[PDB]
Design a protein around this ligand. Structure first.
Ligand code: NA
Ligand code: NA
Ligand code: NA
Ligand code: NA
Lengths: 423, 424, 423, 424
């Protein structure tokens, strides 16, 4: 009769077992490549997948395992695989179910890096990502073909801060027998558990809020385990010749996708996470709810402040009255639609430049989801790779300042942004 | 006036940071870097200015290691990756897209083989495995889709030494780069770029890192390969960078620039700055470790080669080894520190030995300071078919030793004691 | 006209400057022993203290410097020196102003380790620590002699959870021209800034709440800079022969004590903190307010829960109605008297053993101030070194369970402790 | 059947953790460790049971390093500390209380000298500095309060080699331990315990760690010293442990047990598990690095010893060096890799050289892989009076080189180029 722990317990404990050797309370940093095999048979068994155990950190690492289990536990997934980066998580999440010739439907409202991965890198690997305006559920529907393997959206458009109608998009995905992949980087499980809202697979840049401290690039893929792998995902339901005819759904049941992702993509492409990074991201995850609550409390107040400020044209934050995504925010992200939002100063690009140049507390850097408040001009930075049209479709605007509202004293954030605005 | 290898392994790429004057390479365990101005942020993203943008793309700790490996290999630049697998993936994906082919030696690390045969196959990249013993096979396998020839310096675990220069001439004849996975040699024992490689990849996990702590890969660009129409993504405007042409913007660093700006940035198989730091600590002693590794490997290989309980020992430096002359030509300091042997009594004896060694670590790795042992057929190359294993030089009785820097007398004793427990 | 940032901003930003080299937003881990000297003159200048700069990590490290400045900024001190441990902080805090033949007055209500340091280790170095019942201000007064160099108390007795009357004890210390040293480990600057309440010197086990994640042993000494070093502290006001007649108060002004502590004790005894530890403790400090707020919110609810529980004899938490320290809690620790408190089950030692043995979420380990909830029986563990009398005086009791209430879901903590109590 | 040094430096103290089977030593960056039961917690605190209690007291990563250094030195045990200074402090404070004396060579690292002369003096410990050249001075300085003789293996920066065995006989005659700070040699070059040391201390910061990353110290207990009435705290009930007698509970490990249980626990100059991890990575290559260090040092010392712009070179392995025979006797592999030289043109030339070297790192450290240079009189020993500096063998013109593992040709070139810039 196992205990159902709360989020705040899970973010601290989940996936974390006291190692039998040292009884270390902290998750050891298993900064190891390798692990002893007690016997040839055990080694053969580990590689044959006949026995669970550590083989090689590229495949699996006991530090990272904590983080994987922890995020899976927070999202309510069966499993997760940490990656070297959000981008690697996204890459893996797609490549796990999409091969050359396959298609993915993605919101156009993506982080520039995902957009580029989708538009360019995956394109070159024969994966055609069809970008849809996520505001138009029919566009998901229209873009799906026999070749579509997934719908991919961000919980909160980097940096459109649009909230896809997850359950509606999930319905579309599931109607077509394809998984719904939600990049939940902007929300974290604390603000949004996409699995509860139809996501089959959640990915994160753990770089951002999950890690929370701007220290560690990291990604993770969380498998809901909810998705029935069908004939559109032959590699999940057919003998994998690289594992002597292992069938992921047969061997791993509902964990097929995440098992495959580890056994195929993590192992083969090796976008593995450093155990050190895992450890640092774990230290972030330990305070995730606390951070995220402060982040969203601050984001609300900063967004409300900017929303009423006479030198600000607009503020794009779902929680602001009259935001297009307000009701989606209330439905899906009731704790607050993340802590990243955009605003357009009066004076446009030139005012934006001046603001970004005159904030002293906001950190002008390429990141979101640091405990520290971050500012950037997506058009020239995060989404610089996108064509004007792709930027436009990603919700990028020339005057747009993106704020990742940190957990600083809101009064300081307001003061900082106010002082910058008054210059 | 160039610094010697031993100096470079300690110093190359490592600058005293202007802030702290740290002698050690700081662990810049950061995601992000301040942009002084919106103009600077724009310039950085527009590649108008060098600087730190985001650790997925580049990191000053990792930069040291990249520059250092690039310096040791005599490459223009390098990009570190989360793993050797990612380095290999990136090395290929940088220049191969769906529809493309790569010619690879069959004598690969199982994981590379599997990446090539399966994962890349799913990305529309057909790796054609050739028998690297036969230069004609490289030539034969090349098509107008081939984008590279890929070999390991010393096949994991065949310990074959491709005829690098001859293979390089084939690649180059075909206007394709020769990629050498130099994991087993490190630049100390072999600098593939001096022998026709255009691109070197390492699992820095192995000897470069040397301590079994850190998964890491790197791709080193020789800078020598003239990217041609077979690599449009290097010589044609990149729509992801507003029609940047890598060869135009980066000259000889086109490949490695692209690899960072496209694959590292997009797929994000980035190395942890901490891993970079640890690998650096390995690299600092690379020549010392590798010299000891090879001194030990030779002794152990000689010991086992003479041993009444050992059927065979496969190490190029052993008299009569097929690859002996290639070892003399290409790895004169010693053909790495990994070799295989087959005990008399075959697989069963192999298991007894692996079970009986106390000092050798039974684990999946090579190129630890620690002596490692494994049975590749059931582990490292377990994913391969019998045929693939055979083509990879994996044999059922085969024990792979990664000869560490322990006291050779202990390693000999350990293996001797284990052997001397297997009945005649 | 520099900005007065809030606590939450400071815990994130204070002491942290973007390095000119890399512009890293995260505090680099300057895991270096050494630092380049541009010139013999610069090296000579650094060692002669004619120039600030990095010399050697044992003395100073730019990662640790952030943490030092940050804690100094949170406490409102002029400076801090991080140490390898709380114990080293305490050792240094004392040895910086007390030599063989000198005395210190300390509350008997100490962490066993401090008690032992005081009672034994310092005794052997000719420093006689006179232990007073801190409930009796007259006892501080009585125990002070010509030889007394300091009064030392914990903000919240480990594990008595007594609150000394800081300002009253400060008055006694200052009346005798000796500094008041407050071990603020249990509170952190978030709950209590001893410098605002008469402490001249604050020490912490940063191991505990400041670090917050149970990863890193670390201590720090924070100098208020408020204390006028007088003839009782010759080494602060007279030429230091180890620095060619440097006078700390002359060279360092109000930072004399902390400067000396670095230049003499840190340098000479070298209880220095790893830059890595500094980095990890910084990651804790970044969420300090958030953690501490959750900790105290949980501690209150758990203490209130245990305080009403029919299998609990007593709960010692200042914030519980009728606790002796309630008004001291309201005066000094209004945000909550830390998140560590003790309770005596009914059934005494035997029930305590059973509880400690049957908690599944509480971690039975020697630490406090982890994000994770911790449990231990001080009498047999943290204070095991103390004689029955010293334990008694430290507020240790045979039936006493000490809880470090973590930031888990209070419902889980309650459930855990309730389930343990019902066994 | 003992493992060789090279094996021990890689393996000693390192066990495969039962949980993960990590080959690498995990970084147990933990404060705390679960007690399975209140009984277990009680037993651990009551020292009825070995196990992990709290990282200030003991840590499984650090344990590896402690055991490893203890293994390399042939000690019973070791306790790592935050620094060499803390190791020295602990080594002394473990056996000296206020009122006690220590006899130390004057030829000390400035920081030790200063700890001894000032910090310990404030704790009522009178360190009597003797001229280690003259065995009689050790004898003369000993009083019934002396608790130890303390010397460095190779004086920082006098590079004098005490006559360890002769000094050990003096200490032992007086029933006091001989503590050798073996920082400059490491167990690879000198195992003081084999030459009469009872306690060895290191700055692991230096050669043991070898990479300039991590401040660390260790105290190694030979286990050989029979604690007597001059050490009541080792042979009398410890009131802090309910009358535990260290010699009774820990036998030959009394000292090192006490040091952990009293000084480490109470003063908490504990090493970061991360530092332990990094130092371990150094130690893994200790023999390799130290061999290269000494090979390089000899070459550099010979180069400078023959150099027309160098007045003197102080390195025991140089023909005519006062300590040559002691080098032959005690450090036959080479008297460490730190030496001094005085350029012709004295201090001014010294500054020119220090300013002019490009490869040598001007910084305060020794025993980095990197070659280091400094002017001790103005840096490392700056805190000492002229007299103390002189008694420490510090000279105004003196340049201390910590000869790294760079290519000797680069180091020679670097110093040659710098010298050849100083006018005759
Ligand atoms: Na600016
Ligand atoms: Na076995
Ligand atoms: Na139990
Ligand atoms: Na200079």
């Amino acid at each position: 009769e196992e205990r159902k722990y709360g989020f705040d317990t899970l973010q601290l404990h989940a996936g974390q077992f006291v190692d039998r050797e040292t009884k270390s309370r902290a998750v050891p940093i298993y900064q190891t490549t390798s692990y002893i095999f007690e016997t040839p048979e055990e080694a053969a068994d580990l590689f044959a997948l006949k026995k669970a155990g550590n083989i090689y950190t590229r495949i699996g690492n006991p530090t990272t395992d904590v983080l994987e289990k922890r995020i899976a536990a927070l999202d309510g997934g069966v499993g997760a695989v940490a990656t070297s980066s959000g981008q690697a998580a996204i890459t893996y999440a797609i490549l796990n179910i999409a091969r050359s010739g396959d298609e993915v439907v993605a919101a156009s409202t993506l982080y520039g890096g995902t957009y580029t991965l989708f538009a360019h890198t995956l394109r070159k690997l024969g994966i055609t990502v069809k970008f849809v305006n996520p505001d138009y559920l029919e566009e998901f529907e229209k873009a799906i073909t026999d070749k579509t393997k997934a719908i991919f959206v961000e919980t909160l458009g980097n940096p459109n801060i649009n909230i896809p109608d997850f359950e509606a998009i999930a319905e579309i995905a599931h109607k077509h027998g394809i998984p719904f992949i939600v990049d939940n980087t902007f929300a974290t499980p604390y603000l949004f558990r996409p699995i509860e809202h139809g996501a089959d697979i959640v990915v994160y840049s753990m770089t951002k809020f999950l890690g929370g401290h701007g220290t560690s690039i990291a990604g993770i893929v969380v498998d809901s385990g909810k998705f029935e792998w069908n004939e559109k995902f032959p590699d999940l339901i057919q003998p994998d010749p690289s594992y002597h005819g292992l069938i992921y759904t047969k061997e791993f049941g509902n964990a097929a996708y995440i098992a495959k992702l580890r056994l195929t993509l993590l192992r083969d492409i090796g976008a593995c996470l450093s155990p050190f990074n895992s450890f640092l991201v774990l230290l972030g995850v330990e305070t995730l709810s606390l951070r995220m609550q402060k982040h969203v409390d601050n984001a609300m107040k900063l967004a409300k402040f900017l929303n009423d400020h006479p030198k600000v044209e607009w503020v794009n934050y779902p929680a602001l009255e009259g935001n297009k995504y307000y009701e989606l925010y209330k439905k899906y992200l009731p704790k607050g639609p993340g802590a990243i939002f955009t605003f357009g100063p009066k004076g446009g690009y030139d005012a934006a430049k001046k603001i970004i140049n005159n904030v002293k507390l906001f950190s002008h850097l390429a990141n979101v989801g640091d405990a520290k408040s971050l500012i950037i001009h997506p058009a020239s930075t995060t989404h610089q790779q996108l064509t004007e049209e792709e930027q436009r479709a990603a919700g990028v605007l020339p005057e747009m300042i993106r704020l990742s509202v940190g957990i600083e004293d809101i009064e300081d954030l307001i003061y900082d942004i106010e002082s910058a605005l008054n210059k």
